[PDB]
Symmetry: D3
Subunit: 92 residues, 6 copies
């Protein structure tokens, strides 16, 4: 929801406390979290074959991917939203 | 539209070329641009009396305000999105 | 003192060690720390009704507020100084 | 050379003066500049099918691409190095 | 004054308009601007031989130096405050 | 190696896990890590008397210094690469 979407655009320390709040915020709707993990791969390595390059949607996937890596690590990491681009915004 | 909303979240050089592309993107719908200028003052000086503090909505107002200041200046300025806050995202 | 004032302008990981060093640096003078907490709310939600908007003073309040939130949390957070603004520096 | 490689890692205002200094620095060796433009597309959209993801090499391509866009625009833009990633540095 | 001191801590586009406002703000007191240029050299290359390493004072010198380079160039540049350091703040 | 060199250019949370991966990456070659610690002092305080100011080499020293401070502290810190400078890249 809002919490996750707005958090995906921030730079923050991803730790147990933060992982809990953001991961919970995307438990519902159900398929929500898995869709963002499916799109991370496209948005990161196969951006060329994408007829939708929403920056917010990209950020949500970058955060989802980060929560996932943390769920298999427990090691705190600095989360950073994906690089913005004014030339990318003017081109759709 | 998307261009403006996505641009409001970037850090870029606001010059004539950029002012034209972003200002045009918010000519329609009509009241769009004026609403963002009305909300800028609330989001900046009267945040306390607001039962809606969407970060994206805040960014759109910060950019609208920037385009306005540029329309009465012609002097290029570095645009920067408003400060993010993970504690603000977890608090509604 | 200097340590706190200079720290309020940095981006750092606020943890127990750092909380101890900065909170100690503002134990004296006595009313120092409480004044910065009183001003945080003005600088954040009631900026309009303020005939003094010193950026350094704003940063000191943002840090004081951060130390306070940490004293009731123990959870490490990334501290970030408040958004700067060249248009704010030229306007008094 | 050094100037371009080191500049590709900085955040600066790309204008005529800067375009001249950096573009000149990559006139020699000859194929240098064209190779960086060929690699930009891979790094940006086809990163998945790439058995070499040097961050410095990525930055050089991002800057080359920026000089190119400027050569067909004359409009000053803020240049920003590509997003860094500690998780990308530990994975080769 | 305040304008210059507060500006020295911001990231902004240094152009004719901005150069005029900030350079004027340090015309008085008289020796003000020249002292900051004398200290830039120490703060940048001879930091070791300094019994005073105030970050704000360092920023003021970095900005003074920037205004000077601009006075002999007319070419707009992105100004950036000097790197902050929490380990530098805790050590005086 | 690549891991350390590329990491020295990133902004990340330096913790036990990260300290282990980066410190290991510079165990070999042998004198590697000690040379970067010797150069840190020059780059930070005696930059003036230095006929080699490679930014990457500077970053490697800033990271080496950070790993060292962490080896005698165990307290997680946010690592930040040294301030970049386009005016420094055009001057060798
Ligand atoms: Na939800
Ligand atoms: Na529109
Ligand atoms: Na004190
Ligand atoms: Na060359
Ligand atoms: Na890599
Ligand atoms: Na003055
Ligand atoms: Na090695
Ligand atoms: Na250099």
């Amino acid at each position: 929801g809002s919490t996750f979407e707005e958090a995906a655009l921030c730079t923050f320390l991803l730790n147990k406390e933060m992982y809990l709040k953001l991961r919970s915020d995307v438990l519902l709707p159900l398929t929500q979290y898995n869709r963002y993990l499916a799109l991370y791969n496209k948005y990161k390595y196969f951006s060329g074959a994408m007829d939708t390059t929403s920056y917010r949607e990209a950020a949500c996937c970058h955060l989802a991917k980060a929560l996932n890596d943390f769920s298999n690590s427990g090691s705190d990491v600095l989360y950073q939203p994906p690089q913005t681009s004014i030339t990318s915004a003017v081109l759709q």
